[PDB]
Write the structure tokens for this entry.
Amino acid sequence: GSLAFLPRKRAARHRGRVKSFPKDDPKKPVHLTAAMGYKAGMTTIVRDLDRPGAKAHKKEVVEAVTIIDCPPMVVVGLVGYIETPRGLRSLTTVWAEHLSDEVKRRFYKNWYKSKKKAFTKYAKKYAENNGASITRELERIKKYCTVVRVLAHTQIRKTPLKQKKAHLMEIQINGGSVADKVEFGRSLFEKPVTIDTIFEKDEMIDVIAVTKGHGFVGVTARWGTKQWTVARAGQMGYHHRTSVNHKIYRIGKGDDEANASTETDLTKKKITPMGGFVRYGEVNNDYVMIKGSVPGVKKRIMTLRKSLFTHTSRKALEKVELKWIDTSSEFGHGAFQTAAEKKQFMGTLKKDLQTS
Amino acid sequence: VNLRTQKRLAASVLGCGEGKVWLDPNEVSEISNANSRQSIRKLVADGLIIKKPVTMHSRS
Amino acid sequence: IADVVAREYTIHLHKRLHGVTFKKRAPRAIKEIKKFAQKAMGTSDVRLDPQLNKKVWEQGIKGVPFRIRVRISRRRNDEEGAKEKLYSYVQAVNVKNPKGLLTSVVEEE
RNA sequence: CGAAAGGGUCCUGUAAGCAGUAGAGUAGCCUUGUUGUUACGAUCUGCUGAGGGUAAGCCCUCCUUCGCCUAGAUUUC
RNA sequence: ACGAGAUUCCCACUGUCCCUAUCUACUAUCUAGCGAAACCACAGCCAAGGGAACGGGCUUGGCAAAAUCAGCGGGGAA
RNA sequence: UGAGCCCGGGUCGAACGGCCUCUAGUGCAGAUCUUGGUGGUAGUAGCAAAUACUUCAAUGAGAACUUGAAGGACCGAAGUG
RNA sequence: GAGACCGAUAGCGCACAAGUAGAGUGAUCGAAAGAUGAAAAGCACUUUGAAAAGAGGGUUAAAUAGCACGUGAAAUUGUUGA
């Protein structure tokens, strides 16, 4: 096996941390870096390839893509860091007024029995002429910090998940003066940020998630067998992984009602498979169609971040043209893309006449 | 209550095995008092103890 | 609302017996029925009719039916210094098919 | 939130029963039958892509029905 | 010609293998009750040095944080 | 100096000591010592096969392995008679 | 009748229902095991417990002597204190 992933222990957290944001210079415009989504499943697409020099040039190729449900994130805070001889240090963070119930659920282990008063005194700071305190923290970030990050949380009431406790993370603000990005973060308070604004089509991203667990496994399946360097039994899976160079093929809007339609096939259909995504449900929000496979089980929190370096391949900066998107059922050997297509093929049934 | 000895004496009185005699579940207290073969014969007449017939078996 | 109430439910034992070893399906079905009444009626004291044991064991140790239609009746346990004031008694009902039936309340009148 | 139910999606492959002289074949009635009749009759066909199963680690629920709820115990600057 | 005799060759088959994957039952696991034995100077981290190719206690370095659960077989003359 | 000697406090209930001679079955860490008792290991290893058990009631302080009834299995006259 | 003997792992194997219990086909082999209190005065009665027992109350000079009974060391163990 590989000694670069040697401490094969369970991840300390279920969310997964970025661990590196792309290097910042003030010349680029102000932008965000990362976002969160929920893994929905996989589907098959047909792509009109435009790869000069390849055997499949000017031909149709069938590829596997993964769907990540991406409801808009709400910006509810701002954090500032300073450079020290001991690394980066958090100087102060400025929260927004009027936090939602979901983001407060993250702060509690027993939300149902609690007297929900998180940030109750902090809200009075805004509205009781202690706005000097809020501005003093904002000015402190401007004149002392070198990196400013945004606290954004998901909206899982839109996600078909039984979990009600949202997910917080810090997203770095890159490309600008420290003063410019602080005004950027304050203006984003209490506001939803959509995925098509953070990323876009035919760009290559990195995804961070915790892998599927397998429990106690022996040497045959853990280390791949035909001291610290000797294969042993232990935990396999549930490991933090950072996969890079995954191309976004499509960003769906959710309100389009024709998300899975292309310029080639004129079928008004959404991305959700016939009968729903197996073990997940229906994607009713913005979604990111990522090529290939991505670490994590279905309905697992998914961390999307930008590439740390400018790309060196023609796989990037190449246009992606879609011909057809599969929507047939994943619960079996499906053969119908729409409910209408099934009824047209089989005619009318005994129950159809009895009801009518 | 324990009715093991009533089961044995009923088998001898009725002339069959232990598995073919039936003691009334609703009259366990009366049967428990019955500890003599004369008394069990009274319970047999009263219907509280019954000999079950042979098991049916279709030859055809 | 009342402490004494009788209702009829359908129990999907196929859901609760999936994957179980064959030589344990009938005993497991009896335990699942008790758990069903212990949670539907909130009583730890659940008594099953002997003919309910008949219906579960109709088809051998591994032939428990997929759907069983029972009646659970919460009664009062008077006794003398009983640990639980209420008890639930479960019976099998006679229906043409144990499918398509909703939860219903029976009336003593 | 839970249990049912309805719908969808999948799996199998056309349920029990009834009916059609379609039906090979097995037998009675009277007298010859050139088209005589009466019964049984494996099988075939129709009702019937029906019937059965469907989350247990599939999906949805507009009042689809029924029920549960602000606990009780310990510890903590 | 004969032989549960041996060998070679030919046809056929095979998870033997390329290269593994899946499934079932009893264990392994946790609980209630019951409940031993082997063995035991005292202990138990590593490296270099400790003339008698001998170290476990010395030297002088690396170090070094309570209490635990599961896996293993590395160490304990002619 | 030491082997040891003396006193105080607690427990206990019936005999004992100092001096000087006599006498010996007279002084223990070892003997894979003898007898007796007690530890760590340890609430650990482990508590096997004979397909298979389930429901209500009774007894009883206490019921998986005690009884009655009912169900599901078995020996199958070379038997689990 | 005595002893510069032994004093319950000693003295005979046996201070006791000891050549007994027990082992072996048999010839034979062969143990362990003494002590309440001067006197049973061996705890009436009440209460909790299914019971075994516990707690009050009592006998006694003493229960720090309750028949697992004179005195009651160490190994080993519990609680409390540091």
